[PDB]
Amino acid sequence: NLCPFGQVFNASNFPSVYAWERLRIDYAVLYNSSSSFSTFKCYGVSPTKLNDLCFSSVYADYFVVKGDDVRQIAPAQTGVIADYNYKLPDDFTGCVLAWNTNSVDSKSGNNFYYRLFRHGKIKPYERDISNVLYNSAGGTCSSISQLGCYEPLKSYGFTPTVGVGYQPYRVVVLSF
Amino acid sequence: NLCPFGQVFNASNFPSVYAWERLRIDYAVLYNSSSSFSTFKCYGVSPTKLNDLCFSSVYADYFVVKGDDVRQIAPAQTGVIADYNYKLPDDFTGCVLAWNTNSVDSKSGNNFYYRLFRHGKIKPYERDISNVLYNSAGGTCSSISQLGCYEPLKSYGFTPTVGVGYQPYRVVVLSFE
Amino acid sequence: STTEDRAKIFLDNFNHEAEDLSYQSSLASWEYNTNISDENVQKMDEAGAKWSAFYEEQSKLAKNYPLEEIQTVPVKLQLQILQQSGSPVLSEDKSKRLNSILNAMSTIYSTGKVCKPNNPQECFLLEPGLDNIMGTSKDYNERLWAWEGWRAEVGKQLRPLYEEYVVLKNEMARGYHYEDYGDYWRRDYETEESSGSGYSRDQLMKDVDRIFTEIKPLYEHLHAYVRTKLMDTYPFHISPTGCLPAHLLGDMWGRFWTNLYPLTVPFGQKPNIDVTDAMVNQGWDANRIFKEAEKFFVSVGLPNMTEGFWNNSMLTEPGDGRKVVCHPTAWDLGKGDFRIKMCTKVTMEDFLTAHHEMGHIQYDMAYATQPYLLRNGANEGFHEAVGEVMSLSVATPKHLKTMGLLSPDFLEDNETEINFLLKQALNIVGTLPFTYMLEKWRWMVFRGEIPKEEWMKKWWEMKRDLVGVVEPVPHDETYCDPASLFHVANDYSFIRYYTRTIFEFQFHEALCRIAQHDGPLHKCDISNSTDAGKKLHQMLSVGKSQPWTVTLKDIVDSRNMDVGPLLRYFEPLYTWLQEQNRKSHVGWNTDWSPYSDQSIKVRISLYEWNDNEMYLFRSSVAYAMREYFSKKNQPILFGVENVWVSNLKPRISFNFHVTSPGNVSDIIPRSEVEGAIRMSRSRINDAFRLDDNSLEFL
Amino acid sequence: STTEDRAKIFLDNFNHEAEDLSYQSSLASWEYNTNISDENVQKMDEAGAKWSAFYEEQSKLAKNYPLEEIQTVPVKLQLQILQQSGSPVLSEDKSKRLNSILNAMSTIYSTGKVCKPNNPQECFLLEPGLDNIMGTSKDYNERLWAWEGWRAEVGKQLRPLYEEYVVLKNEMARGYHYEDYGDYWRRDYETEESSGSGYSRDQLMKDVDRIFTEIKPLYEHLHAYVRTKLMDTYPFHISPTGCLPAHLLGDMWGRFWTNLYPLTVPFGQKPNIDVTDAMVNQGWDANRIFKEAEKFFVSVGLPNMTEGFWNNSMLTEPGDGRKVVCHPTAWDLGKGDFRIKMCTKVTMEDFLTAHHEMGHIQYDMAYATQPYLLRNGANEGFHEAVGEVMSLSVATPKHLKTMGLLSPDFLEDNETEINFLLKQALNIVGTLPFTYMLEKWRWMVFRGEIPKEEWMKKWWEMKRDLVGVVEPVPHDETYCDPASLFHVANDYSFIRYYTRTIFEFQFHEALCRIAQHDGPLHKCDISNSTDAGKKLHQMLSVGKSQPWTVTLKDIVDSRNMDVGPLLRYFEPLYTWLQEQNRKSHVGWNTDWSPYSDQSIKVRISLYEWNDNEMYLFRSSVAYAMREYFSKKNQPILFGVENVWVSNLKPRISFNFHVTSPGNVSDIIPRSEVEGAIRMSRSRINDAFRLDDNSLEFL
Ligand SMILES: *[C@@H]1O[C@H](CO)[C@@H](O[C@@H]2O[C@H](CO)[C@@H](O)[C@H](O)[C@H]2NC(C)=O)[C@H](O)[C@H]1NC(C)=O
Ligand SMILES: *[C@@H]1O[C@H](CO)[C@@H](O[C@@H]2O[C@H](CO)[C@@H](O)[C@H](O)[C@H]2NC(C)=O)[C@H](O)[C@H]1NC(C)=O
Ligand SMILES: *[C@@H]1O[C@H](CO)[C@@H](O[C@@H]2O[C@H](CO)[C@@H](O)[C@H](O)[C@H]2NC(C)=O)[C@H](O)[C@H]1NC(C)=O
Ligand SMILES: *[C@@H]1O[C@H](CO)[C@@H](O[C@@H]2O[C@H](CO)[C@@H](O)[C@H](O)[C@H]2NC(C)=O)[C@H](O)[C@H]1NC(C)=O
Ligand SMILES: *[C@@H]1O[C@H](CO)[C@@H](O[C@@H]2O[C@H](CO)[C@@H](O)[C@H](O)[C@H]2NC(C)=O)[C@H](O)[C@H]1NC(C)=O
Ligand SMILES: *[C@@H]1O[C@H](CO)[C@@H](O[C@@H]2O[C@H](CO)[C@@H](O)[C@H](O)[C@H]2NC(C)=O)[C@H](O)[C@H]1NC(C)=O
Ligand SMILES: *[C@@H]1O[C@H](CO)[C@@H](O)[C@H](O)[C@H]1NC(C)=O
Ligand SMILES: *[C@@H]1O[C@H](CO)[C@@H](O)[C@H](O)[C@H]1NC(C)=O
Ligand SMILES: *[C@@H]1O[C@H](CO)[C@@H](O)[C@H](O)[C@H]1NC(C)=O
Ligand SMILES: *[C@@H]1O[C@H](CO)[C@@H](O)[C@H](O)[C@H]1NC(C)=O
Hints:
By secondary structure, chain A is mainly beta.
């Protein structure tokens, strides 16, 4: 039986960087042709062929990036997505696939958000779902019209015709 | 059998009232009219019994009338065309036929004239062509910019949308002998 | 051969040739007005100019036949419009100067702008601007600003032009063997029948004075009632005895009082007769208004339309992008073609204008059999009188009730008759003294009775005496207030409106008598009366082919203008105004002014007076006003223009008052001005080399 | 923990949500400016008010972290931009009054109209009106009328509004912990690095004084050459040693002298560089022009456009019906979006303007990585200096020869270089003293050094002393001539053009030195030079993140404003003007005026003196002129406004002269005024209660 991979690559309605839901999960179509993909950079299992290789933990996931934060998806570096939203392990094995979406994620009705503020460092491969209002000092604020409390989930604000770097990018991360 | 009443009603390119010509040449066409005739006033012969009455020789004339002179074409009557262009005899037989031509004789290029001034009275049934300038005293002019001299052949000046009375009228007679 | 045996042949050559050139000139004017754009305005200068140059060309070909030898009427009258309406006998530079003066006066009138001392970027022309302000606003200061702003930023420009206009027009009319331009305007209303029994040109001036004295009891009660109702609004601004201010009359010039109807309405609970909502509810359009208007004329015996009227004349706003002018005019293009050019709406006054404009068309259709020289009215007054008397019979609430526009349960009581009669009088009676004196002022200007240094002194003296209207701001000779009217700046005769009103109700009383009317004259309808239209069509059938005195005699059985029918029309109103003006004062005195009881009488006791001490006195007063308010810590820049001089006798005395800068309605109180002269007395008399005894300052 | 561990989170919260609202505000502004219509200005306002309300809401929230306890540069600079450009500490009615004053000043400047004296109905605006007259007409009288009608019918309206504006702006700027509004405008060019070695706000005044004193000989020689060439035209109207009249400078204000180039061109047989025909002959459009500009910017080393620039920015006039504003501006909409909005044509000036606007865009594209508060120029001069210097290299007639715009047979003689340098100096050198003097006047008005009663006197004294320009008509304190300029009536800083010129020429010399140019500086092209591009982009990348002195040091190797680059650019023109002005006078005297030779000196010897004595004296002089011209049978209505008072010392003496009404250029001769005074001597001094000893009329 073929591996289930095509249920989301040819689909729509991807979540944001704070709602990335993983799937269990042929491999030829990823590297052969597929020139519409924005980048093919691949730390780990390398861009070599996947011809009948024995691998486990083939879980993969997808999320929507502003475009300048695609470079932040790499081990051992700083960045708002790595520090707050999505962190990769230092000894990361797997690969990433990304492509531009000029008029695919840029209608009038769209809502994409990122966690700008959270308490402390984040660790790779865990989920932060709660919309608890961030406090600059600590604890909670439970209000908005005061010093020290800010709303954590700020919008990307995807509008068409913003140029490269703010135009939505659908990146899919593979883990091996 | 055959009666050459054609070539004068359905024919085109009618001349002016001073340029009328004869044809020398069927009374059902007078009743079953192809075109709606404007007038049917007839004196002498009754226009109800025509088929039974015989004839010797019949003549037809055709010209263009301003419209207020259609009443003027009648035996023993006065008027500017009667005085200078076309006079009918007092002992007149037959009658006249006329019909409006609203959009047929009223294009941009249509030149029609009538004789406004002429020396003396005109006898019935003859022709006048010469464009000699009329003089109030008499004789000739040889000059348009002088006192008492006027150009005789004045234009109708037909333009569309002038109203009834100045519309071009084609008048055809059928007088016989 | 001889005269009258070659003159008609020349006259026949004109009649069958000028109608061709006039039709081309009228078609060019018709195609211009319905198609306002470029490359159409020169058609009158290319096709109508050929007809224009042809008219005086035949005038030189005229005058070879003496008028004394000919005796037959239809060719003698046709030779009378000829030999006089030719090229004006003047020098080349003077004729060029006269056309440039007339073009400058029309340009200044149509492009003038008037606006405030504050925010002087916000300004208004006249037709879409101050006409709205002077017609609708109830503010004393806003109306005064528009009234004083006009005649000063526009009328002062026309004063040097009008002085040269009078001299050039008098010289042109003297070449036509007339005594002045006023007698040349009176070349109409001039007939001759037998033994010198015709209407003289001087006979017109005697008759319009006789009519004006007869309307004086009716106008005085109308003036007194309006003045009483103009004291509820504008309190402490209108004297109960003196004249009305000129800026509170409903428009710029006080010509029509009809805009004062909301202020002076009696029985305001009773609504006026309006069928604007009734016609739009029944689905009425432009064609329905004229078709119902045409049915009125068939009912009295007048003929139908000429069938080219419907296919050619525009009766509504064009759907395509063609710019038009929406002035309702009736066009007689000649050669049996009649048209009406107006932008119609589903509105009541556009329903009455359809009857008025087609009345000119029915006038024009009747004398189409006449030659081209006599294809006009019998005079200038009959042409607009026929249109108004046809519209007078359709505004009654009986012709409207028959047509279903007015509901049958409408309350036609005696209270609503006063509302209808008064609204007529503010448009009919109220415009008669204004029309009379403005022509009377213009006649005495042309006759030389009014010198150039008393044009404005005599204009406001007759305005108080004959109209009962006082100016709010004094005007010296630098102003030209008559020229601020359209008919004066554009060189139009104004007596055609005075005699039109007399000929309205003279025809109306005669036609209602034939139509067997029984009740009051104001509730009369001549519809469904073939006998009324039969005697009507006789008067319409003849134009200039008959004297207007015998044309008038054939319809109203009188050879003279009579205002008796006019007074019988307003008899229910006249007997009601006398009841209202019982505790009030009927009349006026010519002494009170809005600037009165605040000015200071100054008597001059001689150094030499050469009109330059007026500038020195008005500057010394303005300096004293500046010094007086500076000690009160109120820095106000008083100028020469803020000092107004009235009652100027050049020998003995004059009156002066001071207004605030930037506010013409803000007259400085007399106690403050007198205190300003008192402490500045030393520098106000030594500038003229005289003591306090010479200028008494009463 | 500490405030530095809260300020960074506060600034990280600020930028990532201010960027979005700034993007919708810029999008609304773009969708208005490209789509001028209804329902387009009603979407900027609520978006702009949302962005503004958020901006002062953050500004109120910003004052929680003092700048003393933070040490790192970028957050300190961001908090320095904050907490000072916030809500102005003022009363609510005072703020409403200030907004109303600014709106009224803008409306008066934009809608002010000036009418001809002979024709009051022919009134002109400024932008499509009087600007054409001052830019094209060579008539002395028409130029004088246009210069005098403006700023008398506009500036007199703006004078009390400008006084209240000055008071309110000083009150507002004093609340921002500044001393003056001129000091508040000098909050730019204000840096700090270490031990107080930063650029002070008072250092800018000393530096621009030094720069103005260093451009004195070149501007003096240019002024002398212009004055010499302005004597062939306008004979008997310009003194060979005096200042130039203000209405003969090519513009309403004498700002740019570039319209005097056809009058003052040397070697007129040599044609100037104009490739408009050679560019319309090869089939060029907007896309080709912008692609060539992009190819030029790529060749030096700057990157391409963002590819949304081509598909979103309108380049030419749209084909459909959509009103636009045709002012060439470069739009940085934020969030990586850059656009250019202009109505370009296939013309050389539009070809240079495209390079100017794309240089502005390349300035904007470089600091996109900076935070939002630092996304500007390092001062208000670098942005326009970069925009002007990127278009200076492409105007060389060698860059055009490579592109094929110029034929290779064209000769580069030493006369075309002089013509180009003179055109540049009329554009560039001729506006530096005007800019410096106007900013000095505004600074001394805001400082209170110039009292409110000496605004106009000090303004024209510094115009004569520094610019070398004399007024043609004397102006008292009623006038406000500084307010007649757009940048003064609309509350805009004006020293940025001065700093633009200085920094532009410094950058030009630096980039030409890097690009290994060998010849003269005016024939230098930096194309195909990657070395200049790197050091250019190093300056471009940093915005407000560094002090402008440090950023300037990294490119021109100097921390100070140096005008030595400017003098080296115009060195052949300077050494040619020194040879041209050999037999002429280099400089001017501040005594000559167009009214100087016809003015009569009046000395006052005491009764009590105020401003009302001036009005009485001017009215007496007008009356004397009226009496003099009345004896010669020339009735002329002289007024107070026809008498002008100049050199008014309020204690001892003043000068006056008389002008004909309706003609401001018609000065009455001094002999006639003296004769009028002699004839009317008693009335002049008897009004003031003094003899000939007190007013002896020198
Ligand atoms: C209104 O006027 C315009 C021109 O002023 C008319 O346009 C002309 O129409 C005639 C009709 O045959 C053409 O021959 C011309 O070439 C047209 N000229 C232009 C400039 O378009 C227009 O037809 C007029 N309107 C009507 C309804 O006749
Ligand atoms: C003029 O007379 C005619 C004929 O009498 C009137 O037409 C009829 O009037 C009656 C009553 O008003 C209506 O009920 C009919 O419907 C009308 N039309 C017919 C019979 O065809 C006409 O109304 C009269 N007009 C005036 C103004 O009196
Ligand atoms: C200009 O002057 C008029 C008249 O003095 C002012 O209008 C009012 O006049 C009445 C009496 O005539 C006074 O009692 C009021 O106090 C006046 N003012 C108002 C506001 O009613 C008018 O206000 C003055 N100013 C302007 C700008 O028109
Ligand atoms: C210029 O602005 C007008 C409105 O000021 C725009 O017209 C609107 O277009 C939208 C399209 O999304 C419609 O939903 C609206 O109903 C339109 N309103 C009106 C009043 O027409 C117009 O589209 C704008 N121009 C461009 C090129 O976008
Ligand atoms: C910058 O250098 C390039 C290449 O050295 C020049 O491009 C050449 O220009 C010439 C003349 O227009 C063309 O004939 C060539 O085809 C172009 N390409 C090449 C590869 O030589 C360019 O013109 C230079 N620009 C300037 C301003 O000097
Ligand atoms: C207004 O005054 C000016 C200046 O006096 C007149 O312009 C000319 O000025 C020169 C000397 O400056 C005289 O020699 C000329 O006679 C003046 N007139 C002309 C026509 O050149 C100007 O004419 C005056 N009038 C107007 C309407 O501007
Ligand atoms: C007038 O026209 C109407 C409508 O066609 C017609 O009924 C009526 O008979 C006509 N009257 C005359 C006198 O032609
Ligand atoms: C109308 O008639 C009634 C009853 O006769 C009368 O009381 C009233 O005064 C009248 N009104 C007018 C305005 O004539
Ligand atoms: C810039 O764009 C041009 C045209 O698309 C291309 O040839 C060139 O390689 C681009 N340069 C860079 C640095 O992207
Ligand atoms: C140009 O050079 C020639 C040759 O030396 C010289 O005679 C001429 O004066 C120069 N022109 C200018 C404007 O410097």
